[PDB]
């Protein structure tokens, strides 16, 4: 195999309680809040179709004018505790927070740029605001992080000159900079997540990529870093030129979730998804009617899907200008947050069953080899089709709700019907079984 300085650093999974932690939440929330909440997708009375956070690229507005925006950063009726409550009822084990998106506004006081929070009317910390209330209500903080800033005239999109090079190591100090700021500021930090370091500039620097890691695990003991994050020697990203994983768990999955037939080897680490309300919208967008707007089962969906395969879902809000949510977001995190409390034992903690997938819709396995059947798609039949790996029988199947008998029976080897409720759960619902070895 090649040579590798740069390359993976984690063997197979890791298994240290931080990990365990971040792993057995599944499910996040995910906030996407800066300066493009206040355009809203809109620039001089024309509303863009691409994500909001993006603006500033469909408007083609300089840095300058973009930047200006903060002038009008007043969010009146933001309450972090709120916030917190949201989350709260929404399900959600921890948040993933825009520290810095692209345009380069940071959400907490920076002392390496003057492009934040405390040169606003507003001035106060949202940043840290946040991670208190959230922490307070028991839900871990991860940051979001864009390495790629659109405020910093250093940041480069390729090396191919000394001039891009020595522009390039000013921007990557200042980032390291931002970056150990975080780390000690809010030392309760579960994860970094970083995005724009998809440029061939990041691709040519991946010792700095490693670098980075390596320095955040330094300053936070049981920190999670992205793959996203990573570059190795060669300049390829997410898994190195050995076909290893790099960072703590596979981050991607946001136009596609793993194919619960064809991609079984995502198994075979931590992952994590994340994803929008709409198509493409991250940041505030004032008109959802320009794509499709997922409903919440199509969103509970994902999320089972996600755990049914090994990984964690997240799910995307992107708050308005004042400081509040939008009544779609609203609704979605109320909607989730019932079903969350009703069939939730089947996703926190949570991970792949082994099982062949079927029809009907998806298996969990607790911790402990509770195998969950959740099913989306109720068969005519009035039979819940289970067909069990070798050595694996199904003693018993609960109603997870009411704890109701559910009718086992064996047609063949290896294989049962599990008889639907005898009352319509009327919503996507879990059927719990016993197995044995
Ligand atoms: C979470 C999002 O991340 C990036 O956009 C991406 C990056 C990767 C994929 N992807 O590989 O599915 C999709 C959107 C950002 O540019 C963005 O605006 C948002 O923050």
């Not at 500021?185 to 579960?190: L, S």
């Not at 998809?198 to 300053?219: C, F, I, P, R, Y």
């Not at 967008?285 to 919440?296: A, G, I, R």
């Not at 990984?311 to 969350?340: C, H, L, S």
Request: with cysteine.
């Amino acid at each position: 195999e090649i040579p590798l300085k740069y390359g993976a650093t984690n063997e197979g999974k890791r298994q240290d309680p931080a990990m365990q932690k971040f792993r057995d939440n599944r499910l996040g929330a995910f906030i996407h809040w800066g300066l493009y909440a206040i355009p809203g997708g809109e620039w001089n009375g024309k509303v863009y179709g691409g994500a909001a956070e993006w603006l500033k690229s469909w408007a083609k507005v300089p840095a300058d004018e973009w930047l200006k925006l903060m002038d009008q950063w007043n969010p009146t009726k933001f309450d972090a505790k709120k916030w917190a409550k949201m989350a709260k009822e929404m399900g959600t084990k921890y948040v993933k927070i825009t520290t810095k998106h692209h345009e380069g506004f940071c959400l907490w006081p920076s002392k390496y740029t003057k492009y934040t929070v405390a040169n606003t009317p507003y001035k106060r910390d949202i940043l840290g605001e946040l991670v208190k209330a959230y922490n307070d209500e028991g839900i871990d903080v991860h940051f979001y992080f864009s390495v790629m800033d659109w405020s910093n005239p250093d940041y480069r999109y390729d090396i191919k000159s000394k001039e891009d090079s020595i522009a390039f190591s000013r921007f990557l100090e200042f980032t390291d900079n931002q970056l150990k700021e975080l780390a000690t500021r809010y030392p309760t930090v579960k994860d970094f997540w970083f995005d724009g370091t998809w440029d061939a500039s990041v691709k040519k620097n991946g010792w700095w990529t490693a670098h980075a890691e390596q320095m955040l695990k330094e300053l936070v003991p049981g920190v999670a870093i992205n793959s996203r994050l990573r570059a190795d020697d060669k300049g390829k990203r997410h898994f190195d030129s050995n076909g290893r994983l790099m960072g703590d768990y596979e981050s991607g999955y946001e136009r596609r979730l793993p194919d619960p037939v064809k991609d079984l080897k995502v198994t075979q680490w931590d992952w994590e998804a994340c994803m929008t309300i709409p198509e493409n919208q991250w940041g505030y967008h004032k008109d959802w009617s320009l794509s499709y707007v997922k409903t919440p089962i199509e969103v509970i969906d994902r999320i089972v899907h996600a755990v049914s395969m090994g990984g964690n879902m997240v799910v995307n809000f992107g708050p308005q200008a004042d400081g509040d949510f939008r009544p779609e977001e609203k609704a979605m995190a109320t909607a989730i947050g019932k079903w969350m409390n009703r069939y939730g034992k089947a996703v926190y903690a949570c991970d792949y069953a082994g099982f062949e997938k079927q029809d009907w819709g998806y298996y969990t396995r607790g911790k402990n080899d509770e195998v969950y059947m959740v099913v989306f798609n109720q068969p005519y039949s009035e039979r819940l089709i289970v067909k069990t790996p070798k050595g694996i029988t199904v003693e018993k199947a609960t109603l997870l709700t009411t704890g109701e008998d559910i009718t086992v029976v064996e047609t063949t080897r290896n294989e049962y019907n599990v008889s639907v409720p005898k009352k319509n759960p009327g919503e996507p619902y879990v059927i719990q079984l016993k197995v044995r070895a």
